[PDB]
Design an enzyme around this catalytic site. Structure first.
Site, PDB file in Angstrom:
ATOM      1  N   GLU A  35     -11.635 -11.825  -1.218  1.00 29.15           N
ATOM      2  CA  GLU A  35     -10.808 -10.582  -1.269  1.00 29.15           C
ATOM      3  C   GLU A  35      -9.807 -11.090  -2.320  1.00 29.15           C
ATOM      4  O   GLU A  35      -9.493 -10.093  -3.164  1.00 29.15           O
ATOM      5  CB  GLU A  35     -10.106 -10.398   0.138  1.00 29.15           C
ATOM      6  CG  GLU A  35     -10.954 -10.147   1.247  1.00 29.15           C
ATOM      7  CD  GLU A  35     -11.223  -8.592   0.960  1.00 29.15           C
ATOM      8  OE1 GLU A  35     -10.882  -8.110  -0.002  1.00 29.15           O
ATOM      9  OE2 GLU A  35     -12.340  -8.184   1.889  1.00 29.15           O
ATOM     10  N   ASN A  46      -7.177   1.452  -4.506  1.00 27.33           N
ATOM     11  CA  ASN A  46      -8.227   1.737  -3.994  1.00 27.33           C
ATOM     12  C   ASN A  46      -8.412   3.154  -4.690  1.00 27.33           C
ATOM     13  O   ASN A  46      -7.555   3.907  -4.990  1.00 27.33           O
ATOM     14  CB  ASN A  46      -8.296   2.095  -2.637  1.00 27.33           C
ATOM     15  CG  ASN A  46      -8.299   0.443  -1.914  1.00 27.33           C
ATOM     16  OD1 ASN A  46      -8.955  -0.110  -2.339  1.00 27.33           O
ATOM     17  ND2 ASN A  46      -7.450   0.234  -1.067  1.00 27.33           N
ATOM     18  N   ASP A  48      -8.917   6.024  -3.143  1.00 30.65           N
ATOM     19  CA  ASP A  48      -8.155   7.011  -2.594  1.00 30.65           C
ATOM     20  C   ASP A  48      -6.778   6.993  -2.502  1.00 30.65           C
ATOM     21  O   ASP A  48      -5.817   7.741  -1.824  1.00 30.65           O
ATOM     22  CB  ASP A  48      -8.622   6.794  -0.804  1.00 30.65           C
ATOM     23  CG  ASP A  48      -7.875   5.422  -0.320  1.00 30.65           C
ATOM     24  OD1 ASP A  48      -7.218   4.572  -1.070  1.00 30.65           O
ATOM     25  OD2 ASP A  48      -8.166   5.231   0.883  1.00 30.65           O
ATOM     26  N   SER A  50      -4.885   4.306  -2.126  1.00 29.85           N
ATOM     27  CA  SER A  50      -3.968   3.242  -1.399  1.00 29.85           C
ATOM     28  C   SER A  50      -4.192   1.856  -2.101  1.00 29.85           C
ATOM     29  O   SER A  50      -4.851   2.048  -2.978  1.00 29.85           O
ATOM     30  CB  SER A  50      -4.849   2.897   0.003  1.00 29.85           C
ATOM     31  OG  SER A  50      -6.001   2.580  -0.320  1.00 29.85           O
ATOM     32  N   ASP A  52      -4.441  -2.369  -1.453  1.00 32.11           N
ATOM     33  CA  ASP A  52      -4.859  -3.455  -0.779  1.00 32.11           C
ATOM     34  C   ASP A  52      -3.909  -4.669  -1.427  1.00 32.11           C
ATOM     35  O   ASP A  52      -3.923  -4.853  -2.691  1.00 32.11           O
ATOM     36  CB  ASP A  52      -6.157  -3.905  -1.116  1.00 32.11           C
ATOM     37  CG  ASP A  52      -7.221  -3.106  -0.732  1.00 32.11           C
ATOM     38  OD1 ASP A  52      -6.810  -2.267   0.265  1.00 32.11           O
ATOM     39  OD2 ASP A  52      -8.238  -3.085  -1.317  1.00 32.11           O
ATOM     40  N   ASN A  59      -5.121  -3.215   3.245  1.00 32.41           N
ATOM     41  CA  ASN A  59      -4.947  -1.923   2.820  1.00 32.41           C
ATOM     42  C   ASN A  59      -3.550  -0.867   3.459  1.00 32.41           C
ATOM     43  O   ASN A  59      -3.181  -1.059   4.624  1.00 32.41           O
ATOM     44  CB  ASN A  59      -5.955  -1.240   3.235  1.00 32.41           C
ATOM     45  CG  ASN A  59      -6.669   0.078   2.462  1.00 32.41           C
ATOM     46  OD1 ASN A  59      -7.656   0.386   2.548  1.00 32.41           O
ATOM     47  ND2 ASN A  59      -5.496   0.861   1.704  1.00 32.41           N
TER      48      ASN A  59
END
Ligand SMILES: [Cl-]
Ligand SMILES: [Cl-]
Ligand SMILES: [Cl-]
Ligand SMILES: [Cl-]
Ligand code: NA
Ligand SMILES: [O]
Ligand SMILES: [O]
Ligand SMILES: [O]
Ligand SMILES: [V+3]
Ligand SMILES: [V+3]
Ligand SMILES: [V+3]
Length: 129
Positions: A35, A46, A48, A50, A52, A59
């Protein structure tokens, strides 16, 4: 902070992740490796809208507040910035809520795709924890 593999394993274990919800320490180290490459300051946007954040790429859609993710929640009740600290306490505490949410570590897509079912003990092998 960019942790070393064994350094993060030791910290995750001190913070109670070793066998948390049945996930051995190697699962958590593996997830962090893919990650964030063990970098507490990692951030990724992201599709969308959002973002991380941190060593476990938590998120803003559900877990933290960043003020820029429309319609999102803050289920860990923290500023997403807290997930970038050199101290992993906030990331660990929030990961414990995420992993208890029903799908276990499948919440981390990199864990599902790159760690799940693999020899995750290799991630903590040789470490003085
Ligand atoms: Cl393990
Ligand atoms: Cl991600
Ligand atoms: Cl927001
Ligand atoms: Cl599970
Ligand atoms: Na949020
Ligand atoms: O530790
Ligand atoms: O994500
Ligand atoms: O900590
Ligand atoms: V993402
Ligand atoms: V501390
Ligand atoms: V220790």
């Amino acid at each position: 902070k960019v942790f070393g593999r064994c350094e993060l394993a030791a910290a995750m274990k001190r913070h109670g992740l070793d066998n948390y919800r049945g996930y051995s320490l190697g699962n958590w180290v593996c997830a962090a490796k893919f990650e964030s490459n063990f970098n507490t300051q990692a951030t990724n946007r992201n599709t969308d809208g959002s973002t991380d954040y941190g060593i476990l790429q938590i998120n803003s859609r559900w877990w933290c507040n960043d003020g820029r993710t429309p319609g999102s929640r803050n289920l860990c009740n923290i500023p997403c910035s807290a997930l970038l600290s050199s101290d992993i306490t906030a990331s660990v505490n929030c990961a414990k809520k995420i992993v208890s949410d029903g799908n276990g570590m499948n919440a981390w897509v990199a864990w599902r795709n790159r760690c799940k079912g693999t020899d995750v003990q290799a991630w903590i092998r040789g470490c003085r924890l």
